[PDB]
Amino acid sequence: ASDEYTAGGFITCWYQTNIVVPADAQSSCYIMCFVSACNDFSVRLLKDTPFISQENFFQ
């Protein structure tokens, strides 16, 4: 959960060298990102998740 004490850090991506494209090839590209946990990953202290809501029992 968010707290200023332990706050994680930051991440950035900067052009090292501008995109070079030939003629007749499209100028703009796209880049997709991925996330995974390494083999040293671990967790603790199970709790509830705030995302899922409810009102009255489902029917």
Binding site: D24, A25, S28, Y30, M32
Partner: protein, 256 residues
């Protein structure tokens, strides 16, 4: 000498050779196989058509356009009208199968694009309106690809399925679908992709018409973008091979 870009697959009569590809993702790590006699239930002797069944099929190729949301097939009923595997499906009460999916979309070096080939066991789609359920005609079609719809489906009294891509019809995050086995068709470094699915189901055998246990989905993340003058029409083609089929309980001809 060798290469990792190239692969050749041979089942029965058919053969598929590809000079640009990646490795073959195998299931969860269980190579498909027949049924050991420890888990068996049916006491009739099973039919093993082998070459008559195991081989590659090619469904209808579907166009791929800049705005195209995506597509889904249902494997247990797609082939049902093709070949003996369509015939041996109608005459038996039970079947056990596993699938090798091979998707082929190629482009020149000047075509941007990215596709997502996932194979989703037991994909259960919702309904347009909240109360009803989808009709058997909407979730399926013979050999034909059903496609998504990019924007929300207006909810009337109809039975239509909910085709929004970002929910992927199952009401989950589309970005998370990669837990299931998958591969990335990428017009940059790839040409075709391949999947091998072992038999996944709660019970050791199943009826084929009732329960569609494996759903195939192709969702473009990065649309097709190309400068003018290059060829416009780029089709996608799917190839589906059963493996190690078995059948039990021969009965009369039909489904009803």
């Amino acid at each position: 000498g060798y290469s990792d870009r190239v692969r050749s697959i041979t089942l029965g009569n058919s053969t598929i050779t590809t000079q640009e590809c990646a490795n073959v993702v195998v299931g969860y790590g269980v190579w498909p196989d027949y049924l050991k006699d420890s888990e068996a239930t049916a006491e009739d002797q099973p039919t093993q058509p082998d070459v008559a069944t195991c081989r590659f099929y090619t469904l209808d190729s579907v166009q791929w356009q800049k705005t195209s949301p995506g597509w889904w097939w249902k494997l247990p009923d797609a082939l049902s009208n093709l070949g003996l595997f369509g015939q041996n499906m109608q005459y038996h009460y039970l079947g056990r199968t596993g699938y090798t999916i091979h998707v082929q979309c190629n482009a020149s070096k000047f075509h941007q694009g990215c596709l997502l080939v996932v194979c989703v066991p037991e994909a259960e789609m919702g309904c347009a309106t909240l109360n009803n359920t989808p009709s058997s005609a909407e979730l399926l079609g013979g050999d034909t690809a059903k496609e998504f719809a990019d924007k929300p489906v207006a909810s009337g009294s109809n039975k239509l399925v909910q085709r929004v891509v970002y929910n992927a019809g199952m009401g989950v995050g589309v970005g998370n679908l990669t837990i299931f086995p998958h591969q990335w068709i990428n017009l940059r470094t790839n040409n075709s992709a391949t999947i091998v699915m072992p038999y996944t189901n709660s019970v050791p055998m199943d009826n084929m018409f009732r329960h569609n246990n494996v759903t195939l989905m192709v969702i473009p993340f990065v649309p097709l973008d190309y400068c003018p003058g290059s060829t416009t029409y780029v089709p996608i083609t799917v190839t589906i091979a059963p493996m190690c089929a078995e059948y039990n309980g021969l009965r009369l001809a039909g489904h009803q």
